[PDB]
Amino acid sequence: HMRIALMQHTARPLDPQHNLDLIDDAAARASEQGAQLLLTPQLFGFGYVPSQICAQVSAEQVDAARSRLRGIARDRGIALVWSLPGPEGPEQRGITAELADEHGEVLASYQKVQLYGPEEKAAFVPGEQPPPVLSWGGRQLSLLVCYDVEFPEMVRAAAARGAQLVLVPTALAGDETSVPGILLPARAVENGITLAYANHCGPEGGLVFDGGSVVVGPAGQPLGELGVEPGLLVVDLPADYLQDRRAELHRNWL
Amino acid sequence: HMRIALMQHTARPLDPQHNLDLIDDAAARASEQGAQLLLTPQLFGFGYVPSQICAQVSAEQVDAARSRLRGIARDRGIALVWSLPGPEGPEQRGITAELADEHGEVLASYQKVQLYGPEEKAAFVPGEQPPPVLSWGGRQLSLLVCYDVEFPEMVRAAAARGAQLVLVPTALAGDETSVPGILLPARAVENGITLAYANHCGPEGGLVFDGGSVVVGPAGQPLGELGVEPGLLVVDLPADYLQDRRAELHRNWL
Numbered sequence A, B: 001h002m003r004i005a006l007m008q009h010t011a012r013p014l015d016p017q018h019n020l021d022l023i024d025d026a027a028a029r030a031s032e033q034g035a036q037l038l039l040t041p042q043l044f045g046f047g048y049v050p051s052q053i054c055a056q057v058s059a060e061q062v063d064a065a066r067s068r069l070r071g072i073a074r075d076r077g078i079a080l081v082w083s084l085p086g087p088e089g090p091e092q093r094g095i096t097a098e099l100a101d102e103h104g105e106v107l108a109s110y111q112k113v114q115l116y117g118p119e120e121k122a123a124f125v126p127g128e129q130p131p132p133v134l135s136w137g138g139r140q141l142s143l144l145v146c147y148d149v150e151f152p153e154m155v156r157a158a159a160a161r162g163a164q165l166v167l168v169p170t171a172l173a174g175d176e177t178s179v180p181g182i183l184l185p186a187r188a189v190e191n192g193i194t195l196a197y198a199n200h201c202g203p204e205g206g207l208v209f210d211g212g213s214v215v216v217g218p219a220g221q222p223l224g225e226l227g228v229e230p231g232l233l234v235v236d237l238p239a240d241y242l243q244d245r246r247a248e249l250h251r252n253w254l
Helices: A016-032 A050-056 A059-075 A117-123 A146-150 A152-160 A178-191 A247-253 B016-032 B050-056 B059-075 B117-123 B146-150 B152-160 B178-191 B247-253
Strands: A002-008 A037-039 A079-082 A096-100 A106-111 A133-136 A139-143 A165-169 A194-198 A201-204 A207-210 A214-216 A222-225 A231-237 B002-008 B037-039 B079-082 B096-100 B106-111 B133-136 B139-143 B165-169 B194-198 B201-204 B207-210 B214-216 B222-225 B231-237
Touching (some): A002 A016, A016 A037, A016 A059, A016 A079, A016 A231, A037 A165, A059 A079, A096 A139, A096 A165, A106 A133, A106 A139, A146 A152, A146 A165, A146 A178, A152 B152, A152 B247, A178 A194, A178 A214, A247 B247, B002 B016, B002 B194, B016 B079, B037 B165, B050 B117, B079 B165, B096 B139, B096 B165, B106 B133, B146 B152, B146 B165, B146 B178, B152 B165, B152 B178, B178 B194, B178 B214, B214 B231, B222 B231
Parallel strands (some): A002 A037, A139 A165, A165 A194, B002 B037, B037 B079, B139 B165
Antiparallel strands (some): A002 A231, A096 A106, A214 A222, B002 B231, B194 B214
């Protein structure tokens, strides 16, 4: 009863009309295939160029891209998860992920807690709030962004609040096979949840993104996967760690 | 500069002279191969029979097996990690793991925090202390027992205190491939540490143990592995998650 899509593509740095036109095209193709939600990659709208987003992308330009993405969700009739800089000035915003429903209503907004490397840490403010968890489509959805999912604590924070399906815009480059190969399957099994991971692919902003977008089910197995080329992955989704964990002790030992 | 051994074998329920004679034999063979430490499986001395340990194994019998195991470490000249019931009466003790050095000195004792299933929870008291971390052989070692390693929080507790090599007596049955296949490699990569896992194998106490004893290095790869038959595995051991994790937030979100 739930069919999701993941958009894997290459963005052009600082060209939102080009990158959002790719998202519009993917949303229309996902909807034609009966997908009910489209997940898109981290910072796709402006490309994964942290220092140049900080230097050249204004709050007004981010708000115009956000309005365009709400319009795509409404006009293509499909829920949409995107990732842009946050709405504040360039010196105060983070990296965010948002979910709009097929009506264009923004159901949830999350600010990336675990920034990756010095360029992100200079260009963005880290989030301070736990991942949101909300009902959509018959299950509890949640959002995280790229490096967050590599911390078991961030996925456990979502699953502790009831998450069953964690959606992760990503921008993973450098042939980092261990993230989708080793960490994502453990995040699924150690919580009993499904995770969807939508990456860039190909050369962008001086990096070569890995592609490898994937949906991993609760037994850690891929339900669908892409390679290194652009694509639109469409997947039909079908003792106990969460109860047994001694959280009152663990919280004191981190 | 560090060579370790793991003993994978079948125990006989409630027959410590038989099971400790197997450990003595493995310790002598490990030492002949220049191993400096031998890791043995969970509750091997009495077999993995929780309800019968609670019903029939006295504090005196546990203390005699402990004295025998300290003697093996000394007399075979090899550090030894074993796992017995704890030293208290049958209604107050837990499942423990201990490390003795090659002099027979007990360096560390740990009580299993995460008991597995209702039979363990009736037969044993859970530990309340974090895993120990200590220098041995040129690195920081730590101890956990079976189900503990399946909680990222338990391995992160050890790595937060400096652990580099986590030694895990186990008793994993039922063809639970996801533990060594999916979870152990993530525990290694998400902390940057090595883990050694020594299981029973074959039918014992009405269960069929999986074998699959393994040492996994920090990239999640097996450095050595056994299948389903008894054996003695001998292995020569050769952005940053531990610093970057926002532990002050994670501790509030578990």
